[PDB]
């Protein structure tokens, strides 16, 4: 019989306004949590319930060390977590738990388990069954029948059951009358003993590209708030020509700032008159935002210089971009 | 015998392997399939100079908004060649230029060059000329991949894929298979008279993402002076969190007469926002993708409208661009 | 969709016909209503109040007849006027022939009903039952489509246009030529899908009797002997699922079979094989019909249909092409 | 799907078998292709054109032809790298399904396509399959018999027409594509299919009397019985769901009585996407055809009917993935 442990941080699942003791209080009403096939389970409410819109990166570090403190004895780790930021929260836990020997899924619901038509019972009762009979070592997100890898989801339907998306990589397994595991490949997966990163506060920018966008927006971040500049650029990772642009660009650079390529499409992959390139900027290849804004949060809060954090960043590291 | 006006902007479709004037003209020489019984005549118009999307600012909408203006009496259909990487952007700024427009208007041009192997050049454009001529639709719209979407509803969201774009919150107008048929998608509000083409002005408009961490200081940054306007990429149905600073920074742009409209930063879904935000002064935009509302923007700051006047604009469906 | 009143409380009629949603491990009576009163998601204030008339037997979908979509008619028929929506519960195995048929039985009708189910059993784990039911008695309270449908994961679909196309997906149904009806999410969205042709007055009930039909599949190598062999005995009606747009082998033996088919009286209509797609018509010169495109289960229910009435022939060939009641895109 | 070498010029062969494709408002077909530059850059292969005579709508096809092709292809596979097929629409399918079987140590590719509107027509899609067809035969030459279609490289025992009207005509419920084409040509990671090693061998497919069974409420056992009458060696019901069929026992008896009498009975699912799990129908000598396509089966039972084997190895091996065609427990 498989144990799991349940961290309820807060969400839509558990609203009523989020109020302490009423998601416990649902789940002893529904017996379906109890039965033989389903695994034991512990739930550990967070103090204070949080809105995930309200999370901040140090959430992310307070979640990691719970499941580090948790780690030796329980079989598998499912986060309840708010949707709004859920994709940042998987992303960031990626990064922060090297060599992982467990499952660690992190869902939620659309609508909380105390309204009509909730999707949270379900979306729970899958997390738990997929944790103790199909796991798979990596931080994942599970909504709607679908297992993904954390760091390569984002909230792409903010009002359907489907909330979440995979843009650039299938998902693990599929739930129907069975669970089949899918044949996305394994991410780069490290054994031996857990390792838990810690996290300091890092001050990053996100600029989105768009026609008409002048210099002064890169001219500000260069003031004194910014250690890193993610840019959402077109299609494959292009920019105007803009020659003032540019130049604060490398300036950026040459100040020290991590300044990454993104596409502000759903999906696709960076692919960079290499201006851009010649300014300082790296290519983030297929990375989300959300993987983008995590992975330099765990980069920047270690003992890494500037030009080491440049080229991890075009790295593979827990699976978040296709090399190549 | 119909006849199309074609607008060649510039693009990927007409590059070779970088730009080259009368390439795409030489090349399409060598198609028969163009000059078919079946098909409506057309002439081509390359612009001077050809432009990468990418470097396309929003004066660049108002030449070609004057151009169709130039033409409209004489042709019965209009394709606008354009490449990829803004297109959504320019289809949408077109939507609320022309007014009462009695004519198609088919934004459309490939992901790889009608120069290279495995174009959807020809295709699209066929298709683009073909359905101006027989299966008018009076509005601005795109087309790629068989489908033809509301223009002021269209993103880029496959960067490499051949089905680049995509209408998240509202089905295609037209599908083509073994024949080309119209949806049942309901029709945007469409005025009827003489056409109006409104000429815009250069507007300092700001693009702030919401993500966990970000600071008040950002959008005090704005406040400095470049902007009249500022668009918010929210969490799901419009949430941010709750940071007082944060909140002060929105309520002091809107003091100073900016208008600040929140978006969902997710593919799809509709923003719905007691109320922090709302009454910090920020305007819902409902499920308005962010090239509509830039352009909305744009196109609103360039007519002598009072700022209470443009705040109640943003939330009202001028042309089929948001479910009211 | 009409978006209805929820100023008063509805009373729901449940036709619990069998199907995986109340089994366990088989049927077993009573199971089904016990984890029902259970589940306290049923009983909000929020939600109608339902009454659910169990079958005797219960049925394991697969084994149902066309006289169990008379029986389920029949059931309708009694209880109209007492309810204000009907929810049939169905096995998945053949709930779209059973939608299909009502669709064309029910003449005037004024209220919704809707079929629904589940993949995996109530009590089971992961089961979609209570969500697929609680959605289904939701949506015949508040949004009171006049029409037979068919609710499965989140989405509501005409009757006659389902086909169940996924046997062990949790989005086990689709409509291949009709978008759904209504989807939920979040909120509960309407789509403006056109109108299906409606009566008025007083629910009338069109009865069926047995029909033997034949379902020819086309494939390559099949013969005129072989369609020669379904000219046997058990057969009113042939349905053809050709290839795409509705094509079939030209051979002039393949052709005279199905002339004399005709000739004799036969009604032999079209269809394609495809998940979607519409016939376009050779066969029309032997007498074959073309069914546009409607899916296998909507003809077959409605050649039920027309062949129990007392009509010609040509009567019965000319409304299979004609839309009845919306299982079919006219020209 | 392996990544070939382009260092050296191609040379593929194309089976112009008839089919939408060629078709007008003999000889049409190539001289349109002469008058395509794209089908004559330097980063395309060289091809040559046999046009079959006559040629045919595929829907007219029957195994003969299957025949036809497969001789085709062996008589000119020392010749040519690689070998794409023209073919109708309407059974494409079938034709890709049926080759699978048939060619062992297959060590080179072979792709069917066709399009859904004429090379004739405006607005044809023909040109574009083709062209993406003969690219991919000589740089992605997966040693499989394939069929590609809007911009999709599909395993063929896998596929079926499923939209009629659409330019996405086919696919593969129960797996996901070989191959992707956009900007650029990925690759997915679909797990290889069984191989041989060798010269290419063609098994020899004859026309065999299979009968067609779909259960739908109120088939009578009338069905069966008659289809017990001649016309059958084996016998595909297309059930409910994961293979369910009605519990009758007539039903069950004529069922049994045709796996007594030597036919091979499979059971499949009518279903477009989904596994057989079957008990009934078990005990009564019916074979459980898991995810298998009709097509796949069809084409399956002609090709092991045809081969040296008694009824009890055929009706083991209809249920084990000689080709790619099912998934394994
Ligand atoms: N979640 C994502 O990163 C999606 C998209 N690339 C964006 O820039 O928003
Ligand atoms: N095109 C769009 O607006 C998509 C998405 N809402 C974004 O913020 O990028
Ligand atoms: N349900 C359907 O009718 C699907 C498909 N046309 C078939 O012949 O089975
Ligand atoms: N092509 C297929 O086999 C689809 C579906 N299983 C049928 O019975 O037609």
């Given at each position: 019989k498989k144990s799991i442990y349940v961290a309820y941080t807060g969400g839509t699942i558990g609203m009523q306004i989020p109020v302490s003791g009423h998601l416990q209080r649902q789940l002893a009403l529904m017996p379906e949590f109890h039965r033989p096939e389903m695994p034991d389970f512990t739930i550990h409410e967070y103090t204070p319930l949080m809105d995930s819109s309200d999370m901040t990166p140090e959430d992310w570090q307070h979640i990691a060390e719970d499941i580090k403190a948790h780690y030796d004895d329980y079989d598998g780790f499912v986060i309840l977590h708010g949707t709004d930021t859920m994709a940042y929260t998987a992303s960031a836990l990626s990064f922060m738990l090297e060599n992982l020997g467990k499952p660690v899924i992190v869902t939620g619901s659309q609508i909380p388990l105390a309204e009509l038509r909730s999707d949270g019972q379900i979306n729970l009762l899958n997390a738990l069954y997929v944790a103790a009979n199909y796991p798979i070592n990596e931080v994942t997100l599970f909504f709607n029948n679908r297992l993904y890898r954390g760091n390569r989801t984002?909230?792409?339907?903010?009002?359907?059951?489907?909330?979440?998306?995979?843009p650039n990589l299938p998902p693990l397994l599929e739930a129907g009358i069975h669970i089949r595991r899918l044949n996305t490949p394994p991410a780069p997966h490290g054994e031996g003993e857990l390792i838990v990163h810690p996290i300091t506060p890092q001050p990053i920018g996100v600029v989105t590209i768009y026609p008409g966008i002048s210099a002064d927006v890169v001219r500000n971040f260069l003031r004194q708030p910014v250690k890193a500049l993610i840019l959402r650029s077109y299609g494959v990772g292009n920019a105007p020509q803009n020659k003032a642009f540019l130049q604060e660009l490398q300036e950026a650079s040459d100040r020290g700032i991590v300044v990454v390529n993104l596409t502000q499409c759903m999906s696709g992959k960076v692919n960079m008159g290499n201006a851009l390139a010649h300014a300082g900027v790296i290519g983030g290849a297929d990375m989300t935002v959300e993987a983008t804004l995590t992975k330099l949060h765990y980069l920047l809060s270690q003992e890494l210089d500037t030009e080491t954090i440049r080229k991890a960043m075009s790295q593979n590291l827990r699976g978040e971009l296709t090399p190549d």
């Open positions: 984002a909230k792409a339907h903010a009002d359907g059951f489907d909330a979440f998306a995979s």
